[PDB]
């Protein structure tokens, strides 16, 4: 099995315009949003068929019930923040939690806050520690390690917990999260030879090119994997053609254990 | 679905040794309490335990074994007023405690 | 500091007679419940207000109603009471819910006893 990830975010406004949330929980499971709050409907929802269809109402409505209390949580926690900047406006308060399953069968695990989209606090499940960005944090650091039964706890979480809700939904959309979907790839000129793939999945790819069997990678424009719309994605991979002499360029392409060579004449 | 046991009395002499026993079968653990009721009174919290091992507190200590899904309150040099019942609480993945029956423990002077 | 004070300490019922039970905290706690005890089984949640703002129901439901009505109470609600409501409850509270580590603060009890 390849590797697989879960992740929830949180985000926090502290003076958002009108009609915007105040607050916003997303849960993802690889690059699939499984789980929605907000603010303004107040009710947790499933964004993936597979999660509707295998967790009954009753697993909605406490999760419903959580999630209110963390928004108020979370609201608390900016207010704080914000007091302690001595900012004024309007600021952003962010969380991101989560664990990743890899193919060899080992774990990851990580936990950390932001404010204005920077890295606030980081967890380390190892040291059971904290690590803070500035004096602000470095005081919320100081509250959050006196409780070391919370540590401990948010340890046991990552490793064991997060691990198990991450095979419960890999089983649920197995259909969705573990099929293969092979790229087309092409060559063409535009002077630059660009390398294009499209119409796969997982998203996960490597592209690169080779000249005479040498990767140059300073000399390489990478692509970003961008989402298609229909569940597939696509990228590319363009390198710069040497006019004053001919050489013998290939794209390669990595993507779920095959490999592709395609050579440029 | 979910269990919890521990036994329904306990006596033990005073000045000795006592270990109450709690084991659970939950979907999912985040933590299991420890808390003291005293006859017609309200339970306080004594300990949490959440990663396996050992944790200290006074004449009283909790252990946990997560694999074996079992945990021991342990009260060393009884006195009369350890005389209560003893209630182990289990968190699942959805944080809902699941509480167990309760042990009484009886205290020969 | 008070704590969670829960008022009555008791009360004999009719069936079919009303009644509402007070639970208070005094420590700006989020999340309040009420349990009801009984012999030879665990606590076991009626209904439970995560946060201000919101309530749910817990294990029995069935006879009672709750209203959070602030930050600070939670009462209970027996509209018609039934001889198996006979029970000694108990209101608590704690910090956060979800939080892992945080323990329940309890309130002094209300014996009950329900009588045709």
């Known amino acids: 099995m390849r590797t697989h990830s879960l992740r929830y975010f949180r985000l926090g406004v502290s003076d958002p315009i009108h009609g915007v949330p105040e607050f916003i929980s997303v849960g993802y499971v690889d690059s699939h949003p499984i789980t929605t709050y907000d603010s303004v409907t107040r009710q947790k929802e499933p964004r993936a068929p597979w999660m509707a269809e295998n967790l009954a109402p009753d697993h909605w409505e406490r999760y419903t019930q959580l999630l209110r209390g963390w928004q108020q949580m979370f609201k608390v926690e900016l207010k704080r923040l914000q007091r302690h900047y001595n900012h004024s406006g309007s600021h952003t308060y962010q969380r991101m939690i989560g664990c990743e399953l890899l193919e060899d069968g080992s774990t990851t695990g990580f936990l950390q806050y932001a404010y204005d989209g920077q890295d606030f606090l980081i967890f380390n499940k190892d040291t059971l520690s904290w690590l803070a960005v500035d004096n602000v944090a470095h005081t919320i650091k100081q509250a959050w390690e006196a409780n070391q039964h919370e540590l401990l706890y948010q340890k046991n979480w990552l490793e064991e917990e997060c691990i198990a809700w991450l095979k419960r939904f890999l089983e649920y959309g197995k259909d969705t999260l573990q099929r293969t979907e092979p790229p087309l790839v092409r060559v063409n000129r535009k002077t630059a030879l660009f390398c294009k793939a499209h119409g796969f999945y997982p998203p996960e790819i490597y592209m690169t090119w080779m000249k005479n069997g040498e990767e140059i990678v300073q000399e390489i424009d990478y692509g970003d994997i961008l989402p298609s719309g229909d569940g597939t994605y696509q990228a590319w991979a363009s390198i710069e053609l040497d006019p004053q002499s001919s050489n013998l360029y290939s794209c390669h392409v990595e993507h779920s254990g095959v490999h592709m060579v395609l050579q440029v004449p | 679905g979910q269990n919890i046991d521990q036994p329904t009395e306990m006596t033990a002499t005073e000045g000795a040794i006592v270990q109450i026993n709690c084991t659970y079968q939950?979907?999912?653990?985040?933590?299991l309490f420890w808390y003291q009721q005293h006859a017609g009174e309200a339970p306080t919290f004594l300990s949490y335990?959440?990663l396996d091992g050992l944790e200290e507190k006074g004449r009283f200590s909790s252990f946990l074994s997560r694999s074996k899904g079992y945990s021991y309150l342990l009260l060393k040099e009884l006195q009369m007023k350890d005389s209560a019942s003893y209630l182990c609480?289990?968190?699942?993945?959805?944080?809902?405690?699941?509480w167990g029956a309760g042990t009484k423990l009886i205290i020969k002077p | 500091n008070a704590g969670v004070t829960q008022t009555p300490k008791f009360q004999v019922l009719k069936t079919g007679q009303s009644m509402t039970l007070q639970c208070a905290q005094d420590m700006n706690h989020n999340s309040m419940y009420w349990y009801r005890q009984d012999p030879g089984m665990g606590l076991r949640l009626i209904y439970y207000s995560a946060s201000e703002g919101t309530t749910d129901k817990g294990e029995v439901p069935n006879g009672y109603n709750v209203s959070r009505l602030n930050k600070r109470e939670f009462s209970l609600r027996l509209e018609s009471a039934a001889p198996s409501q006979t029970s000694v409850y108990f209101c608590?509270?704690?910090?956060?819910?979800?939080?892992?580590?945080?323990?329940?603060?309890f309130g002094e009890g209300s014996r009950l006893t329900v009588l045709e």
């Open positions: 609480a289990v968190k699942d993945s959805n944080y809902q405690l699941i």
């Open positions: 608590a509270s704690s910090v956060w819910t979800g939080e892992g580590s945080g323990e329940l603060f």
């Open positions: 335990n959440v």
């Open positions: 939950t979907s999912g653990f985040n933590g």
